[PDB]
Amino acid sequence: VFRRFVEVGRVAYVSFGPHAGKLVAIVDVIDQNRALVDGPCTRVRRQAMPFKCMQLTDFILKFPHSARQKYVRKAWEKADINTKWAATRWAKKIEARERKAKMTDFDRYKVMKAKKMRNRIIKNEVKKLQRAALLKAS
């Protein structure tokens, strides 16, 4: 079954191309594999864009199929897409990936040191729990 459709007013996340990594709102469907979109608030000038480079999110905001950027921005601000996107888990994973990429060598060493303890404690406690479960089974 399909849950994410392409209609007027859906928010999609651009994966690659000029505006890579930005949200956008679908205004119209030009053709089978091209849509007229704009990110009035995410800094993306109104333009055409292929379907091959956007990934659909589960955010819908209402405006007519050819409304101008004024009304598109009005609907975007009214629905407050930015904070909800920042709060969703998708953006959290993206932001964490960006953090890991940005990490320099000193924080790499610090992360190694912290992970050593984290794994050691977890492994010891897991051994304790496994022994306890075995004793309970016996």
Partner: protein, 176 residues
């Protein structure tokens, strides 16, 4: 013509040189879809030589300039009247496309002609390009996009960038 890249629309006006017979020959204007102004002028001379008794040696390009799209943010339906050469005989046709720019629609027309009839740019003679209302559209491939509540999914997304993780332990997912 070599339909290189995306075409551009040029307004080209030309006239015969003044002669003792007539001081001021009438100026003739034409719309040329071309990669650049040089080939635009060449096509203008070709068409005007077919139409009138005019040649480049006995004429002059009074003006030649690109005409920009009037509304490049409104998706429009374009009807194109076209004249092309097959392997046996020549035919007139009318085709509709859907795009934001007249030049983009004409480029789509050239690519579609090459794909469907193996006709080449030196065979296609473009005649008329008009904005056509959705009620006046008559090709179903364009008409099916005329509704307020358009809605369709992307069913089978094929994995691109197949080579960046050239060896990956997942079998990729095609349902998003």
């Amino acid at each position: 013509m070599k339909a290189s890249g995306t075409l551009r629309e040029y307004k080209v006006v030309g006239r015969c040189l003044p002669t003792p017979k007539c001081r001021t020959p009438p100026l003739y204007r034409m719309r040329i879809f071309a990669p650049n102004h040089v080939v635009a002028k060449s096509r203008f001379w070709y068409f005007v030589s077919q139409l009138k008794k005019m040649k480049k040696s006995s004429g002059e390009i009074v003006y030649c300039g690109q005409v920009f799209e009037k509304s490049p943010l409104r998706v429009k339906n374009f009807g194109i009247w076209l004249r092309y050469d097959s392997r046996s005989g020549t035919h007139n046709m009318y085709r509709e496309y859907r795009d934001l720019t007249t030049a983009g629609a004409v480029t789509q027309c050239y690519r579609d002609m090459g794909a469907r009839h193996r006709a080449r740019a030196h065979s296609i003679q473009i005649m008329k390009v008009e904005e056509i209302a959705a009620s006046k559209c008559r090709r179903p491939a364009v008409k099916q996009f005329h509704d307020s509540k358009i809605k369709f999914p992307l069913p089978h997304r094929v994995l691109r960038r197949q080579h960046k993780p050239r060896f990956t332990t997942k079998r990729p997912n095609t349902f998003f």
